[PDB]
Design a protein around this motif. Structure first.
Motif, PDB file in Angstrom:
ATOM      1  N   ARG A  33     -48.063 -24.558 -27.397  1.00  0.00           N
ATOM      2  CA  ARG A  33     -47.367 -24.225 -28.649  1.00  0.00           C
ATOM      3  C   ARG A  33     -48.340 -24.015 -29.814  1.00  0.00           C
ATOM      4  NH1 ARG A  33     -43.882 -29.519 -28.331  1.00  0.00           N
ATOM      5  NH2 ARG A  33     -45.796 -30.064 -27.220  1.00  0.00           N
ATOM      6  N   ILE A  34     -49.517 -24.602 -29.719  1.00  0.00           N
ATOM      7  CA  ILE A  34     -50.530 -24.496 -30.786  1.00  0.00           C
ATOM      8  C   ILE A  34     -51.469 -23.339 -30.487  1.00  0.00           C
ATOM      9  CG2 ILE A  34     -52.229 -25.626 -32.235  1.00  0.00           C
ATOM     10  CD1 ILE A  34     -49.554 -27.034 -32.285  1.00  0.00           C
ATOM     11  N   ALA A  35     -50.914 -22.164 -30.735  1.00  0.00           N
ATOM     12  CA  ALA A  35     -51.473 -20.852 -30.364  1.00  0.00           C
ATOM     13  C   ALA A  35     -50.481 -19.802 -30.856  1.00  0.00           C
ATOM     14  CB  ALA A  35     -51.695 -20.754 -28.874  1.00  0.00           C
ATOM     15  N   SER A  36     -50.925 -18.539 -30.942  1.00  0.00           N
ATOM     16  CA  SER A  36     -50.032 -17.441 -31.342  1.00  0.00           C
ATOM     17  C   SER A  36     -49.997 -16.439 -30.191  1.00  0.00           C
ATOM     18  CB  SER A  36     -50.538 -16.749 -32.622  1.00  0.00           C
ATOM     19  OG  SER A  36     -50.673 -17.666 -33.708  1.00  0.00           O
ATOM     20  N   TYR A  37     -48.829 -15.847 -29.957  1.00  0.00           N
ATOM     21  CA  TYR A  37     -48.655 -14.957 -28.824  1.00  0.00           C
ATOM     22  C   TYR A  37     -47.925 -13.734 -29.287  1.00  0.00           C
ATOM     23  CZ  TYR A  37     -49.363 -19.298 -26.181  1.00  0.00           C
ATOM     24  OH  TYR A  37     -49.851 -20.485 -25.718  1.00  0.00           O
ATOM     25  N   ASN A  38     -48.293 -12.582 -28.727  1.00  0.00           N
ATOM     26  CA  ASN A  38     -47.415 -11.405 -28.731  1.00  0.00           C
ATOM     27  C   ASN A  38     -47.411 -10.730 -27.361  1.00  0.00           C
ATOM     28  OD1 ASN A  38     -46.237 -10.377 -31.535  1.00  0.00           O
ATOM     29  ND2 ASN A  38     -48.199 -11.442 -31.903  1.00  0.00           N
ATOM     30  N   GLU A  39     -46.215 -10.479 -26.822  1.00  0.00           N
ATOM     31  CA  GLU A  39     -46.009 -10.090 -25.425  1.00  0.00           C
ATOM     32  C   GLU A  39     -45.230  -8.805 -25.248  1.00  0.00           C
ATOM     33  OE1 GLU A  39     -44.138 -13.130 -22.947  1.00  0.00           O
ATOM     34  OE2 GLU A  39     -44.474 -11.919 -21.084  1.00  0.00           O
ATOM     35  N   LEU A  40     -45.638  -8.024 -24.247  1.00  0.00           N
ATOM     36  CA  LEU A  40     -44.889  -6.863 -23.762  1.00  0.00           C
ATOM     37  C   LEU A  40     -43.433  -7.281 -23.510  1.00  0.00           C
ATOM     38  CD1 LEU A  40     -44.738  -3.964 -22.573  1.00  0.00           C
ATOM     39  CD2 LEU A  40     -45.633  -4.853 -20.437  1.00  0.00           C
ATOM     40  N   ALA A  41     -42.506  -6.487 -24.020  1.00  0.00           N
ATOM     41  CA  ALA A  41     -41.072  -6.820 -24.001  1.00  0.00           C
ATOM     42  C   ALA A  41     -40.301  -6.005 -22.964  1.00  0.00           C
ATOM     43  CB  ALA A  41     -40.476  -6.581 -25.360  1.00  0.00           C
ATOM     44  N   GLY A  42     -39.825  -6.688 -21.931  1.00  0.00           N
ATOM     45  CA  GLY A  42     -38.904  -6.102 -20.981  1.00  0.00           C
ATOM     46  C   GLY A  42     -37.609  -5.603 -21.608  1.00  0.00           C
ATOM     47  N   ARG A  43     -37.272  -6.070 -22.813  1.00  0.00           N
ATOM     48  CA  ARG A  43     -36.112  -5.542 -23.550  1.00  0.00           C
ATOM     49  C   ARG A  43     -36.352  -4.127 -24.099  1.00  0.00           C
ATOM     50  NH1 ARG A  43     -33.571  -8.504 -28.401  1.00  0.00           N
ATOM     51  NH2 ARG A  43     -31.817  -7.226 -27.695  1.00  0.00           N
ATOM     52  N   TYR A  44     -37.600  -3.821 -24.444  1.00  0.00           N
ATOM     53  CA  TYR A  44     -37.913  -2.587 -25.177  1.00  0.00           C
ATOM     54  C   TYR A  44     -38.699  -1.564 -24.350  1.00  0.00           C
ATOM     55  CZ  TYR A  44     -36.513  -5.656 -28.985  1.00  0.00           C
ATOM     56  OH  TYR A  44     -35.852  -6.552 -29.774  1.00  0.00           O
ATOM     57  N   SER A  45     -39.343  -2.012 -23.274  1.00  0.00           N
ATOM     58  CA  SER A  45     -40.234  -1.160 -22.514  1.00  0.00           C
ATOM     59  C   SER A  45     -39.717  -0.989 -21.094  1.00  0.00           C
ATOM     60  CB  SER A  45     -41.644  -1.755 -22.477  1.00  0.00           C
ATOM     61  OG  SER A  45     -42.233  -1.711 -23.768  1.00  0.00           O
ATOM     62  N   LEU A  67     -55.287  -3.806 -38.630  1.00  0.00           N
ATOM     63  CA  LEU A  67     -55.048  -3.237 -37.300  1.00  0.00           C
ATOM     64  C   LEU A  67     -54.852  -4.322 -36.228  1.00  0.00           C
ATOM     65  CD1 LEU A  67     -57.401  -0.071 -37.431  1.00  0.00           C
ATOM     66  CD2 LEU A  67     -54.935  -0.220 -37.890  1.00  0.00           C
ATOM     67  N   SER A  68     -55.348  -5.534 -36.461  1.00  0.00           N
ATOM     68  CA  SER A  68     -55.059  -6.682 -35.568  1.00  0.00           C
ATOM     69  C   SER A  68     -53.556  -6.959 -35.413  1.00  0.00           C
ATOM     70  CB  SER A  68     -55.752  -7.941 -36.060  1.00  0.00           C
ATOM     71  OG  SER A  68     -57.127  -7.707 -36.196  1.00  0.00           O
ATOM     72  N   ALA A  69     -52.818  -6.851 -36.512  1.00  0.00           N
ATOM     73  CA  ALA A  69     -51.344  -6.943 -36.509  1.00  0.00           C
ATOM     74  C   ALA A  69     -50.695  -5.768 -35.802  1.00  0.00           C
ATOM     75  CB  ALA A  69     -50.809  -7.045 -37.935  1.00  0.00           C
ATOM     76  N   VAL A  70     -51.178  -4.558 -36.079  1.00  0.00           N
ATOM     77  CA  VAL A  70     -50.648  -3.360 -35.444  1.00  0.00           C
ATOM     78  C   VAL A  70     -50.741  -3.452 -33.912  1.00  0.00           C
ATOM     79  CG1 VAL A  70     -50.908  -0.896 -35.169  1.00  0.00           C
ATOM     80  CG2 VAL A  70     -50.920  -1.864 -37.495  1.00  0.00           C
ATOM     81  N   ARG A  71     -51.913  -3.836 -33.413  1.00  0.00           N
ATOM     82  CA  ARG A  71     -52.172  -3.973 -31.979  1.00  0.00           C
ATOM     83  C   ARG A  71     -51.281  -5.027 -31.315  1.00  0.00           C
ATOM     84  N   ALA A  72     -51.133  -6.194 -31.951  1.00  0.00           N
ATOM     85  CA  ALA A  72     -50.340  -7.281 -31.381  1.00  0.00           C
ATOM     86  C   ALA A  72     -48.880  -6.883 -31.320  1.00  0.00           C
ATOM     87  CB  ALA A  72     -50.516  -8.537 -32.200  1.00  0.00           C
ATOM     88  N   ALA A  73     -48.402  -6.236 -32.374  1.00  0.00           N
ATOM     89  CA  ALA A  73     -47.044  -5.760 -32.454  1.00  0.00           C
ATOM     90  C   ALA A  73     -46.759  -4.681 -31.412  1.00  0.00           C
ATOM     91  CB  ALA A  73     -46.793  -5.212 -33.834  1.00  0.00           C
ATOM     92  N   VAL A 128     -48.038  -4.071 -28.490  1.00  0.00           N
ATOM     93  CA  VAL A 128     -47.936  -4.551 -27.106  1.00  0.00           C
ATOM     94  C   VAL A 128     -46.476  -4.713 -26.676  1.00  0.00           C
ATOM     95  CG1 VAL A 128     -47.937  -7.068 -27.360  1.00  0.00           C
ATOM     96  CG2 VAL A 128     -49.046  -6.016 -25.401  1.00  0.00           C
ATOM     97  N   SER A 129     -45.573  -5.003 -27.618  1.00  0.00           N
ATOM     98  CA  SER A 129     -44.148  -5.101 -27.296  1.00  0.00           C
ATOM     99  C   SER A 129     -43.594  -3.881 -26.600  1.00  0.00           C
ATOM    100  CB  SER A 129     -43.297  -5.309 -28.549  1.00  0.00           C
ATOM    101  OG  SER A 129     -43.476  -6.619 -29.033  1.00  0.00           O
ATOM    102  N   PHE A 130     -44.087  -2.712 -27.008  1.00  0.00           N
ATOM    103  CA  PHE A 130     -43.622  -1.412 -26.502  1.00  0.00           C
ATOM    104  C   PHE A 130     -44.584  -0.819 -25.474  1.00  0.00           C
ATOM    105  CE2 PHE A 130     -42.125  -2.126 -30.841  1.00  0.00           C
ATOM    106  CZ  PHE A 130     -40.736  -2.018 -30.649  1.00  0.00           C
ATOM    107  N   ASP A 131     -45.585  -1.598 -25.078  1.00  0.00           N
ATOM    108  CA  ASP A 131     -46.577  -1.176 -24.103  1.00  0.00           C
ATOM    109  C   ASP A 131     -47.459  -0.079 -24.711  1.00  0.00           C
ATOM    110  OD1 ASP A 131     -47.730  -1.592 -21.613  1.00  0.00           O
ATOM    111  OD2 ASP A 131     -46.327  -0.298 -20.547  1.00  0.00           O
ATOM    112  N   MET A 132     -47.832  -0.283 -25.975  1.00  0.00           N
ATOM    113  CA  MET A 132     -48.619   0.666 -26.755  1.00  0.00           C
ATOM    114  C   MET A 132     -49.809  -0.043 -27.408  1.00  0.00           C
ATOM    115  SD  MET A 132     -45.382   2.541 -28.566  1.00  0.00           S
ATOM    116  CE  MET A 132     -44.215   3.513 -27.606  1.00  0.00           C
TER     117      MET A 132
END
Ligand SMILES: Cc1cc2nc3c(=O)[nH]c(=O)nc-3n(C[C@H](O)[C@H](O)[C@H](O)COP(=O)(O)OP(=O)(O)OC[C@H]3O[C@@H](n4cnc5c(N)ncnc54)[C@H](O)[C@@H]3O)c2cc1C
Ligand SMILES: Cc1cc2nc3c(=O)[nH]c(=O)nc-3n(C[C@H](O)[C@H](O)[C@H](O)COP(=O)(O)OP(=O)(O)OC[C@H]3O[C@@H](n4cnc5c(N)ncnc54)[C@H](O)[C@@H]3O)c2cc1C
Ligand SMILES: Cc1cc2nc3c(=O)[nH]c(=O)nc-3n(C[C@H](O)[C@H](O)[C@H](O)COP(=O)(O)OP(=O)(O)OC[C@H]3O[C@@H](n4cnc5c(N)ncnc54)[C@H](O)[C@@H]3O)c2cc1C
Ligand SMILES: Cc1cc2nc3c(=O)[nH]c(=O)nc-3n(C[C@H](O)[C@H](O)[C@H](O)COP(=O)(O)OP(=O)(O)OC[C@H]3O[C@@H](n4cnc5c(N)ncnc54)[C@H](O)[C@@H]3O)c2cc1C
Ligand SMILES: O=c1ccn([C@H]2C[C@H](O)[C@@H](COP(=O)(O)O)O2)c(=O)[nH]1
Ligand SMILES: O=c1ccn([C@H]2C[C@H](O)[C@@H](COP(=O)(O)O)O2)c(=O)[nH]1
Ligand SMILES: O=c1ccn([C@H]2C[C@H](O)[C@@H](COP(=O)(O)O)O2)c(=O)[nH]1
Ligand SMILES: O=c1ccn([C@H]2C[C@H](O)[C@@H](COP(=O)(O)O)O2)c(=O)[nH]1
Lengths: 220, 218, 212, 214
Positions: free
Chosen positions: A81-93, B23-29, B31-35
């Protein structure tokens, strides 16, 4: 970018780092109205902090990783939990045909009724069936966020992980360890290798004084 | 990089390090769309979008380290921001220096006082000086520093390192870069905002425009 | 439940969610000898997350310098008395002479004590004078010493509370916060005796809870 | 209090520390008076002084499909304990959408067939799972063939501030319908135990769209 391949299609890649071993030294030294000294005294301070449990100075070292891993691995990983994540979304992709198929050697040490090759085969069969169904549902007009629910836990996902060295060392303690699932151990070995290359003094001091796992003392 | 802004009479905010940029924010965001990244137009637009819709997690991949010199009463409010990392000068361990925030007369602007503001200033420096000289006497007498220092007033300057990501930093700015916050921390928050603006201009501009809840930056 | 600390301080239990069985239910994900056994097992093996489902709210009166050390524990919730808004009360921690036992001092201990009271009194009198002159409280209070008492509510789970006890119920921590930590520990033991017992035995990293 | 969700899901209240007055006591720093206490709650909520609400805490026991749990567990300011696929033999429990889940979407096959197709792969994956287990394959490996609609169970301990963030984001028409349904359950329980905070939340701080309509 430093990029290490894990499993059959997986990887861990270093995107960015803030700071180095000396970021920890500078942070610790402020306690005594001091800053940096010599290489010898500064490296020994890092060892001092690690041997005595002073962990906060290492929060000032931060890494961003780009990771591709099976969902069952990501699910364990994201418990940190002490970390930040952003993940590929099966909802959108629309998800790609990419799944983790264990090699036959994965089942080394288990007496198995059927050959390891057959286990590997049966996993692949479910994977192809599920994926075909996933594409059939999408083609029929089924929203992606519903269609994807038939996909198996060995589906590969991708994420950015931003994490500081203290939390990273907790991760290594718990995941670079023979109790964690073999699959996540492999990812934790790659995280350790990147950490060691960027923060060699902290890594070596951690292994020597603070690290609680078993495998990183065995595997270079 | 390296930036430094002096605050109050003896204080400062210094940027020691930074990881990432807009651009660090742009890249992380993306990834949601596989981009990943695209063009400046579409990527600046994305940052405005993220900020408009309250999609704040991509900004956690932008990270700052500041070196701050501030009075204890300011630090005490600041250190209530838990989503960050701190290391601070220790009264238990260090012989503390004679540095105290003495308000200028102008600090009482708009307040009708019974004695001239310059006298208020004087009275503050007198008590500070007495307190400090007592602290030193106790130290010279062999009293442990951790006990001697308890007579020291809340305007004593302390120093600390602060590591914080852009999302927590935007929360800090919403709360402290605001008229309801104490003027002294407002001044530090203004310096934090200036540094943020320099390193992440797209994020900052979008923050001001679409998400910032305070009144002094606008 | 309330424990007096220092000359004017205290720690009191305001509320608590759960008991030792809360951690047992979380660990098993459901819903006496084997349950205590699971508590020791979790503790011995470093499985700490189950203890997060036991939560306490304390009300604490403590000198600012103690509170500043305390509020560095980020995994918890705090609400503190406002000095910007409230006229502050004449209450300061004056050490007892015995606080300087061990230390060979050029000023008798009783005299150090006296020197601290004097500053406190002069500082408070300056504060009061400023307020009387129409200086805003948020400015007037900056002359008050670090031994001024404040009060706060602290809400913390057992896992973070064990981390607090590892660090503060220890001889390296300032004696003043050690006393507070001893009080927190006593309340923790009252409410969660199985967890507390196993904590001491298997996980606790400090020294003073083994002696007192 | 236990509310059924989806086809085999639930949200169950296990424990609670405090009530609306716990936020009032914290805000005032004082260990009552209904109108003035409600007024304070509204004042805090209106001006975004949210820290007093962290002193009200809930424990839930939730049964949900892994695709829902993966979304839920992104809420980091909270505590979680989950049934382990590595150590336990997994139960034949999967979420299969009703035909009405897809009514509205123009689809080229009957929704009924979408249900059948989904059920078919579930059944096949589960069978392979059991076979592999029977063969001696570690559970941790055998379960990798199980689809994302597999039901899991966890304990969730969360304070009212973090729970209100969760409602902002999940009790909202942008969140996946499945997790919306859980959020409505969470909200009902929160409303029951903390009526003044919930009302003030809706009136002043809630950023979603469903809870004002339902
Ligand atoms: C071998 C193994 C088996 C596991 N089995 C299971 C299982 O069966 N079921 C299951 O649900 N999970 C299981 N886990 C996951 C485990 O319970 C933790 O969720 C995960 O390891 C993250 O650990 P963490 O809390 O230490 O890390 P983080 O969540 O990153 O926290 C880092 C540190 O900050 C602290 N912290 C952060 N948030 C809080 C908080 N809210 N309260 C108190 N302290 C906090 C703690 O000091 C912690 O060490 C397993 C992990 C391993 C390695
Ligand atoms: C409609 C919808 C679509 C989504 N799509 C995606 C997606 O495509 N990809 C993806 O990866 N995620 C996605 N998410 C998840 C989202 O990014 C967050 O992980 C999730 O909403 C949890 O939010 P949180 O950070 O506010 O909650 P928590 O993690 O519980 O944190 C609560 C609060 O504490 C703060 N906070 C906690 N930790 C930190 C920290 N380390 N740094 C700074 N502040 C912190 C913030 O103030 C936050 O509001 C989506 C969520 C929704 C509702
Ligand atoms: C004008 C002003 C007056 C104030 N007056 C007082 C006062 O009289 N008394 C007093 O005690 N404080 C007071 N404060 C401090 C205030 O209550 C907060 O402690 C401070 O502003 C930090 O805000 P934060 O919690 O949002 O930031 P952080 O603590 O950094 O947290 C960032 C975000 O993460 C989340 N978060 C972090 N930890 C948790 C958690 N454990 N549970 C749920 N969510 C979490 C929240 O979403 C939060 O917005 C005042 C602040 C201001 C600006
Ligand atoms: C004897 C002693 C001397 C000290 N001297 C100094 C000093 O000179 N200068 C100084 O600044 N402080 C000093 N401290 C304070 C100390 O550095 C910590 O701030 C304090 O002990 C809080 O510990 P904690 O972070 O473990 O607890 P919390 O802040 O409550 O966190 C609990 C746990 O969760 C984790 N955690 C929470 N947030 C993060 C994060 N952002 N990143 C990684 N992990 C996180 C860690 O696992 C941590 O153990 C001292 C403390 C003691 C006991
Ligand atoms: O509405 C959403 C979409 C995505 N995610 C998070 C959960 C997973 O970690 C990852 C992708 O989720 P799915 O899109 O695959 O549901 O991002 C959410 O939390 N909520
Ligand atoms: O503007 C404010 C007022 C109070 N507090 C917090 C900090 C302290 O922990 C406590 C009391 O602060 P003072 O009002 O005494 O500064 O409340 C702030 O963070 N900002
Ligand atoms: O034993 C200690 C020493 C220091 N600090 C933290 C608290 C303050 O934020 C800062 C300075 O504390 P003092 O040494 O001045 O108490 O470091 C602690 O928490 N515990
Ligand atoms: O080694 C493990 C086992 C479990 N879990 C967590 C992740 C999930 O949230 C839950 C169940 O994981 P599985 O056992 O199903 O992998 O517990 C881990 O983090 N690491």
């Amino acid at each position: 970018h430093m990029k290490i391949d894990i499993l059959d299609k997986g990887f861990v890649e270093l995107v960015d780092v803030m700071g180095n071993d000396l970021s920890a030294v500078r942070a610790a030294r402020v306690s005594f109205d001091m800053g940096l000294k010599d290489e010898e005294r500064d490296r020994h301070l890092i060892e001092y902090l690690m041997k005595h449990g002073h962990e906060t100075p290492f929060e000032h070292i931060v890494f961003t990783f780009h990771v591709k891993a099976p969902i069952f691995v990501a699910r364990q990983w994201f418990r940190h939990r002490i970390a930040s994540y952003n993940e590929l979304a099966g909802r959108y992709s629309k998800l790609s045909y990419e799944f983790y198929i264990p090699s036959p050697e994965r089942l080394e040490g288990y007496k198995t009724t059927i050959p390891p090759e057959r286990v590997t085969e049966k996993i692949s069969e479910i994977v192809d069936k599920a994926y075909r169904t996933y594409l059939e549902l999408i083609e029929s007009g089924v929203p992606r966020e519903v269609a994807r629910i038939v996909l198996p836990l060995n589906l590969y996902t991708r994420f950015f992980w931003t994490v500081n060295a203290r939390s990273l060392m907790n991760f290594l303690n718990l995941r670079a360890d023979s109790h964690a699932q073999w699959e996540i151990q492999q990812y934790a070995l790659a995280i350790a290798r990147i950490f060691k290359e960027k923060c060699p003094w902290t890594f070596e001091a951690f292994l020597k004084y603070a690290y609680k796992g078993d495998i990183l003392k065995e595997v270079q």
